[PDB]
Amino acid sequence: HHMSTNPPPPETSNPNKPKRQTNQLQYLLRVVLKTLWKHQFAWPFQQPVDAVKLNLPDYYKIIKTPMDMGTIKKRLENNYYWNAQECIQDFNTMFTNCYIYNKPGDDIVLMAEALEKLFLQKINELPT
Ligand SMILES: COc1cc2c(c(OC)c1OC)-c1ccc(OC)c(=O)cc1[C@@H](NC(C)=O)CC2
Numbered sequence: 001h002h003m004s005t006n007p008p009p010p011e012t013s014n015p016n017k018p019k020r021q022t023n024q025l026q027y028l029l030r031v032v033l034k035t036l037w038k039h040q041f042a043w044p045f046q047q048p049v050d051a052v053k054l055n056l057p058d059y060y061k062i063i064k065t066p067m068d069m070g071t072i073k074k075r076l077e078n079n080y081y082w083n084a085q086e087c088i089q090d091f092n093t094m095f096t097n098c099y100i101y102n103k104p105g106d107d108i109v110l111m112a113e114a115l116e117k118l119f120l121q122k123i124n125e126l127p128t
Pocket residue numbers: 044045049054056097098101102103106107108
């Protein structure tokens with residue numbers, strides 16, 4: 001009777017949202033996102049959590065601000081962001097969602113931690 005569904009994905013396109021192309025946002029796409037996207041642990045993070053497919057009916061009860069690298073990649077390619085901080089916040093939301101939903105010893109958490117370490121190493125060099 002009652003089907004579980006996924007929420008609409010986060011907005012990747014809004015012509016009326018203020019947006020800029022900055023050196024920092026270019027670095028976030030060409031260096032930061034590119035590095036994490038190709039990482040051996042990227043696969044769970046390359047698209048919204050599909051709670052229907054993965055049989056996680058509780059995921060979107062716990063995680064109220066979903067984020068993932070597929071969304072971030074589209075945002076960067078679509079010039080969705082006003083500043084680097086908005087994009088950094090999306091990465092932080094993605095990692096934090098994983099830590100919140102799962103338990104500290106879990107494989108998925110180990111994966112997120114490795115991606116986060118690389119992320120922090122790259123944003124240490126954010127230009128400007
Ligand atoms: C049945 O197979 C899978 C099922 C899930 C996940 C997953 O990717 C590792 C799977 O492998 C395809 C899974 C995926 C993504 C998550 O966040 C990105 C998450 O928090 C959490 C998960 C999963 N939880 C854990 C502790 O790995 C639950 C659902």
